Amino acid sequence: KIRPECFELLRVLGKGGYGKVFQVRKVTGANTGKIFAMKVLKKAMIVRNAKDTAHTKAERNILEEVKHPFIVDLIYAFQTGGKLYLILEYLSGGELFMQLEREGIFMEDTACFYLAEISMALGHLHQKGIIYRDLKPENIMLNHQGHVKLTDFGLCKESIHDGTVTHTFCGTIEYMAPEILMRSGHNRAVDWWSLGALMYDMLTGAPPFTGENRKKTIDKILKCKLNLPPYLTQEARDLLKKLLKRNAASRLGAGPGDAGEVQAHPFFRHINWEELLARKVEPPFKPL
Ligand SMILES: C[C@H]1CCc2nc3ccccc3c(C(=O)O[C@@H](C)C(=O)Nc3ccc(S(N)(=O)=O)cc3)c2C1
Numbered sequence: 001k002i003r004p005e006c007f008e009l010l011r012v013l014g015k016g017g018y019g020k021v022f023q024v025r026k027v028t029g030a031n032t033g034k035i036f037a038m039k040v041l042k043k044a045m046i047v048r049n050a051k052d053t054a055h056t057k058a059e060r061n062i063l064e065e066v067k068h069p070f071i072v073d074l075i076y077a078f079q080t081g082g083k084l085y086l087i088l089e090y091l092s093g094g095e096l097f098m099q100l101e102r103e104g105i106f107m108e109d110t111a112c113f114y115l116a117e118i119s120m121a122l123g124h125l126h127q128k129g130i131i132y133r134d135l136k137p138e139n140i141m142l143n144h145q146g147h148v149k150l151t152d153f154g155l156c157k158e159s160i161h162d163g164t165v166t167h168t169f170c171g172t173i174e175y176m177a178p179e180i181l182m183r184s185g186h187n188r189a190v191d192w193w194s195l196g197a198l199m200y201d202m203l204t205g206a207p208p209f210t211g212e213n214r215k216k217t218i219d220k221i222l223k224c225k226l227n228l229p230p231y232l233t234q235e236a237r238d239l240l241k242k243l244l245k246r247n248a249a250s251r252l253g254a255g256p257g258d259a260g261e262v263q264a265h266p267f268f269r270h271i272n273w274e275e276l277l278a279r280k281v282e283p284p285f286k287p288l
């Protein structure tokens with residue numbers, strides 16, 4: 001039986017309205033000294049709300065079922081009378097957000113690497129019927145080697161919330177597909193839109209539809225009038241056009257082929273998917 005006492009707390013990694021994440025090491029037994037991130041949620045913050053409760057369960061079920069290098073690993077999960085615990089792998093490589101800040105613009109080959117790894121994560125989730133929605137730089141962490149890990153499948157991580165009913169829009173909404181902001185119904189095609197907004201951000205320095213404020217930004221995303229700057233490679237331009245389509249069903253990846261359709265695009269012509277998935281490819285950025 002794994003218990004909170006099995007872990008020594010080393011620092012606070014983050015906190016919000018529902019709980020905290022601690023860095024921990026295992027105190028005794030197997031992997032005595034192995035470092036983890038420990039997410040601790042307060043049941044009382046959650047159990048009163050049918051939505052947040054379902055959301056919580058969904059997180060654990062997803063992270064329990066997922067077995068994939070480019071998605072954050074769930075090692076143990078247990079609960080006490082008042083708290084839910086998730087022992088996760090610790091991601092030392094920080095945020096991809098912190099990488100875009102330094103670089104400003106990624107070189108094509110660097111963007112291509114990350115977009116490729118993310119696409120395999122998305123393919124993994126989608127064949128499981130899971131829709132990410134929240135693809136954005138703050139959500140993409142790196143492990144110690146420098147590979148991608150998708151995070152944030154659970155309760156809202158923000159300190160400032162949008163409205164009093166939902167947490168769907170609390171983050172930046174710059175990478176979110178128009179049909180979600182439209183509430184016109186959506187499916188896995190939103191992740192391929194988001195992949196495009198992220199790709200655009202990597203290669204231009206800012207997401208494709210940003211305005212002076214939030215309302216102006218939403219208006220731009222909805223209007224969806226894409227201007228591709230002339231310095232983008234022919235391959236990136238072509239992929240960006242096909243990802244950032246307002247009509248969901250027309251997006252690359254929206255087809256029955258999903259991630260395979262996107263991975264087959266010339267923008268990824270140099271990618272060896274077998275060696276990428278097996279983490280044999282050297283990352284452009286190396287934290288340690
Ligand atoms: C998920 C782990 C995985 C490894 C990791 N590894 C980290 C390594 C270094 C620094 C932070 C790490 C975090 C981390 O804590 O991420 C932040 C952004 C975070 O999770 N904030 C947060 C979490 C929960 C809540 S809530 N809903 O309880 O109120 C609010 C804010 C992490 C996070």
Ligand SMILES: [Zn+2]
Pocket residue numbers: 156157158160161162166167170
């Ligand atoms: Zn929120």
